[PDB]
Amino acid sequence: VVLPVARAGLAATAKKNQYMGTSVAPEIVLTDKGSDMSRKVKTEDKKVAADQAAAMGILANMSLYASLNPVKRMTYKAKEQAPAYVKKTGNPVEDFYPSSWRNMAPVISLSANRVAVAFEKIDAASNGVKANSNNKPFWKSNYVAPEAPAAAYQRYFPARIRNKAPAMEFRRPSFANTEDPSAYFMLQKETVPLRMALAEKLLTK
Amino acid sequence: AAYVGGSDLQALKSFIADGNKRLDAVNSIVSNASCMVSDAVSGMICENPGLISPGGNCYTNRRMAACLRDGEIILRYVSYALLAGDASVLEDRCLNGLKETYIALGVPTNSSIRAVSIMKAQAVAFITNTATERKMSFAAGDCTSLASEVASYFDRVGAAIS
Amino acid sequence: MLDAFSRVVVNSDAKAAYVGGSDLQALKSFIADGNKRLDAVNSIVSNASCMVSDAVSGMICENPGLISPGGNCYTNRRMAACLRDGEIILRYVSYALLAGDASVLEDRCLNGLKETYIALGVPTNSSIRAVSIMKAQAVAFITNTATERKMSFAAGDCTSLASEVASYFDRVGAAIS
Amino acid sequence: MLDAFSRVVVNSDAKAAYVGGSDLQALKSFIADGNKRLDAVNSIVSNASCMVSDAVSGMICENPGLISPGGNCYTNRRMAACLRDGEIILRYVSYALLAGDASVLEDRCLNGLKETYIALGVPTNSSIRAVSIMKAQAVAFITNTATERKMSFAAGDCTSLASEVASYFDRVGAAIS
Ligand SMILES: *C(=C)C1=C(C)[C@@H](Cc2[nH]c(/C=C3N=C(/C=C4\NC(=O)[C@H](C)[C@H]4[C@@H](*)C)C(C)=C\3CCC(=O)O)c(CCC(=O)O)c2C)NC1=O
Ligand SMILES: *C(=C)C1=C(C)[C@@H](Cc2[nH]c(/C=C3N=C(/C=C4\NC(=O)[C@H](C)[C@H]4[C@@H](*)C)C(C)=C\3CCC(=O)O)c(CCC(=O)O)c2C)NC1=O
Ligand SMILES: *C(=C)C1=C(C)[C@@H](Cc2[nH]c(/C=C3N=C(/C=C4\NC(=O)[C@H](C)[C@H]4[C@@H](*)C)C(C)=C\3CCC(=O)O)c(CCC(=O)O)c2C)NC1=O
Ligand SMILES: *[C@@H](C)[C@H]1/C(=C/C2=NC(=C\c3[nH]c(C[C@H]4NC(=O)C(C=C)=C4C)c(C)c3CCC(=O)O)/C(CCC(=O)O)=C2C)NC(=O)[C@@H]1C
Ligand SMILES: *[C@@H](C)[C@H]1/C(=C/C2=NC(=C\c3[nH]c(C[C@H]4NC(=O)C(C=C)=C4C)c(C)c3CCC(=O)O)/C(CCC(=O)O)=C2C)NC(=O)[C@@H]1C
Ligand SMILES: *[C@@H](C)[C@H]1/C(=C/C2=NC(=C\c3[nH]c(C[C@H]4NC(=O)C(C=C)=C4C)c(C)c3CCC(=O)O)/C(CCC(=O)O)=C2C)NC(=O)[C@@H]1C
Ligand SMILES: *[C@H](C)[C@H]1/C(=C/C2=NC(=C\c3[nH]c(C[C@H]4NC(=O)C(C=C)=C4C)c(C)c3CCC(=O)O)/C(CCC(=O)O)=C2C)NC(=O)[C@@H]1C
Ligand SMILES: *[C@H](C)[C@H]1/C(=C/C2=NC(=C\c3[nH]c(C[C@H]4NC(=O)C(C=C)=C4C)c(C)c3CCC(=O)O)/C(CCC(=O)O)=C2C)NC(=O)[C@@H]1C
Ligand SMILES: *[C@H](C)[C@H]1/C(=C/C2=NC(=C\c3[nH]c(C[C@H]4NC(=O)C(C=C)=C4C)c(C)c3CCC(=O)O)/C(CCC(=O)O)=C2C)NC(=O)[C@@H]1C
């Protein structure tokens, strides 16, 4: 026998200021060039806009002032803000210096009545190769090398020939009188080792 | 929108002898209204730097652009109140419902009063031409009655949020 | 923890700001040695290029092995990274002198710098010698005892800021140790 | 093909030959009495470490004065060099068996050997005894008459190949004679 939502709306409407949720404010502009025929006053309701661009200038400049002030640093102890979740990868180079922050440093510039701080990515170089040329953009951008291996007599045997000998290996076909593609022979050359541990073990015996 | 000028403007000036003095006091506020609001809100943060801290109400660019809007909406009504001579439009459209709005949003009322206090200080400097950085050219005379009235209109703002 | 300024710069809101005009003069009221502190920052910043170039070259003189074949300042990029890091290290100490706070220096720059350097195989002992050379030029510049370039200053005592800067460099040495 | 094999062992810039499938069937057609020859050289290389150690251990057993002070197998360096030479000679004789001619052994191993042994003071008579043991071992493995190892072969006679291998060893003693 009661409609509560209808009562809530009617009670709210009967008291609510219509202008409070519209940001409309009266604009005044006056014209005056020193003659009685020039003077004119006009008024007009006009919605006041939020200029987000100029709000950045106040926010940036004051936060520098808030940080250089040392007595507001103790009478206003500001709060810690927890950083946003970014996944860690275990390598400290990407954990502690991510590419969003890497190489930024504060330029300080001091003039008559102006103290300015600017964070800038610091690059420097040797010859014509820059420090951050390792991380050039993609629009500015092969074979594989093999793994390397570990004399009065000289008239008779040169140093390029000494201790050099043939080397050879075999695998006969697996089955009697029958073809086998897994069968092989190999022929090669190599310098014979010193064999000094076997020579010591043989000399001891 | 309305316009008044020429012969019709002289009729409205006949109703009050300070007609030129009242109009010369609105021209010292609407000409400097951009510098006033920018300095008031900045001066509010010099005094209370916790507003641009984490959890502050002027942290993030979206909120401070709304804070800068509010000092402008407030100042435009007070400038209209001076031109009209009455507080009726100021109270009915701007101040009715403001405090109930601010408590719901979490807007700090005490620091909001500090910005209005600065603009009241900036207003009376401009009206009485006593500003230390800038001057205006005026016919010689005394506007102390009008500068007292602008102070009263700012206090209706402060009372409504207290 | 950050300060008010570096917190907005990590958010990518604004990269630069200035305090000036009347608002600078109000900042002077809340600081002792306010003209002095801005003067000591000027002595570092106006010599930032010469200081870093002196430091890494002095590291070469003190130990020639860094530009050995098989060294670590061999190839042109690693040398350029050495000059870049010495410039980066120096500019944070100049900001730490300005605000009188090591916090942004410690949280942004010094945090995890050692384990990075171990991962790169950077000789941490020689990086000490760069930042300890950079200390010596800073204290020499501030007290105006610098032999080669003399600055013009209103007279007074600057032992306090001289002792302050030596602490900041010593903190960098501790993290990089 | 067999001429290119000789270039692979002689040249210093020869790609190590791999032979399989149809190329191994081609090689089997080129070698004279191929499967017995391949089985003759397999019997040597499969025992080559035991052969060289036993042959030098044999020449020392028969003349222990070679291990006394002033003996030419005294000290580890000498013993190592003798062991090394025994394997070198065995390896070049095994290639002469693969090839069915002595030329690679004569040209690459025996030319100059006598003069080096004379210049070094290496005793040729005891060297000839080491060679004579490896002759006896090689004849035994090729004919499958070794005392402590048997290999697996199709039944037949390989005495021609054993007589040929004996001629290659007998050549080493005639070159250092
Ligand atoms: C924080 C560092 C801080 C503020 C920033 C600033 C806030 C503040 N300002 C005043 C006084 C005035 N500011 C005025 C504005 C301007 N003057 C101009 O010349 C241009 C046109 C305009 C914009 C910059 C004005 C007119 C005044 C009036 C008196 C004066 O001239 O000084 C105050 C003091 C308020 C008071 O008088 O009680 C404050 C707090 N000052 C800061 O410290
Ligand atoms: C190798 C040959 C090697 C050098 C390289 C050099 C390295 C070195 N430098 C110093 C001390 C200073 N360098 C300074 C920098 C300069 N002075 C200026 O006027 C310009 C602007 C600037 C660039 C040239 C300064 C100011 C100092 C401090 C000296 C002073 O009191 O003025 C040192 C000594 C530091 C130390 O280890 O104690 C060294 C070793 N010397 C080399 O041998
Ligand atoms: C002193 C104690 C002393 C010796 C050391 C040893 C030297 C020696 N060796 C042979 C003959 C052979 N040795 C062979 C080698 C091996 N036989 C095997 O079964 C294994 C796998 C391998 C490594 C140990 C072989 C195969 C023979 C041939 C045997 C045959 O006669 O058919 C001899 C005897 C021949 C000669 O005089 O040259 C000697 C002396 N013997 C010692 O007395
Ligand atoms: C003297 C050496 C022996 C003996 C040997 C015999 N082997 C015979 C045949 C044979 N041997 C092999 C292995 C050989 N051929 C290869 O391709 C390779 C390696 C790549 C090797 C090591 C093969 C494959 C064959 C063919 C038969 C088979 O196994 O399928 C053989 C018969 C020769 C013939 O008449 O064709 C003999 C005599 N026999 C002896 O009794 C002495 C001890
Ligand atoms: C207090 C704010 C000042 C001050 C103000 C005075 N102005 C006087 C005369 C005057 N001013 C204007 C311009 C004004 N009247 C308009 O209609 C227009 C807008 C359309 C403007 C903004 C005029 C026209 C006049 C009249 C004289 C003239 O023709 O120039 C004045 C004298 C009193 C009076 O004339 O009523 C005063 C006191 N002077 C000050 O010293 C304080 C700081
Ligand atoms: C130790 C570092 C020096 C030393 C420092 C002093 N500077 C003094 C006065 C002074 N310096 C400046 C320039 C500086 N302050 C600023 O606001 C600006 C621009 C932003 C710069 C970077 C100024 C303007 C002044 C004030 C001039 C005046 O006296 O009217 C000074 C005197 C006391 C003081 O005001 O702090 C000192 C001791 N002087 C030295 O001899 C050592 C080497
Ligand atoms: C700056 C001086 C303050 C501050 C102000 C903020 N106001 C926010 C929103 C807001 N303000 C109003 C009242 C205002 N709008 C009107 O239309 C009228 C006049 C007719 C008045 C004077 C309203 C109704 C609203 C809400 C609607 C909207 O967003 O436009 C605001 C954002 C709140 C939020 O975070 O959501 C701020 C920050 N806050 C401060 O701390 C300083 C003191
Ligand atoms: C010269 C004084 C030293 C030294 C310098 C080198 N640093 C190298 C790479 C590197 N440096 C950093 C830390 C640096 N990056 C930042 O953003 C800032 C803080 C704002 C710091 C201070 C990082 C994270 C890295 C690696 C990532 C990169 O630069 O791309 C470097 C090259 C080694 C390499 O990259 O493999 C050198 C040579 N090392 C020395 O030995 C002398 C003493
Ligand atoms: C073991 C039965 C001997 C014995 C042998 C020693 N030979 C020594 C040195 C040596 N041997 C050769 C010939 C060898 N090298 C080759 O490159 C080739 C074929 C391609 C052959 C056959 C040479 C050229 C040399 C000198 C160079 C080298 O050492 O590699 C040797 C070392 C002598 C010494 O330094 O005292 C020994 C012990 N010694 C014996 O007494 C028995 C009889």
Numbering used by the authors:
A (entry chain A): 36 to 176, 182 to 190, 200 to 254
B (entry chain B): 16 to 177
C (entry chain C), D (entry chain D): 1 to 177
Sentences from the paper on this structure:
We call the family of scaffolding proteins CaRSPs (CALM repeat scaffolding proteins), where each CALM domain binds a PE β, stabilising and locating it within the red algal PBS. Further inspection of the deposited maps for the P. purpureum red algal PBS revealed evidence for continuous density linking clusters of cryptophyte-like PE β subunits together; three such clusters were identified, corresponding perfectly with the three candidate CaRSP sequences that we identified from P. purpureum. The other two clusters have three and two scaffolded PE β subunits which correspond to the predicted domain architecture of the sequences that we call CaRSP1 and CaRSP2, respectively. For the unmodelled region of LR6 and most of the remaining two CaRSPs, we built de novo models including models for the metamorphic N-terminal domain of the associated PE β subunits. Analysis of each CaRSP structure confirms that they are scaffolding proteins given that two have an anchoring domain and all CaRSPs make multiple contacts with red algal PBS rods as they weave between ‘lone’ PE β subunits. Remarkably, the two CaRSP:PE β complexes in G. pacifica precisely overlay with LR6 and CaRSP1 of P. purpureum.
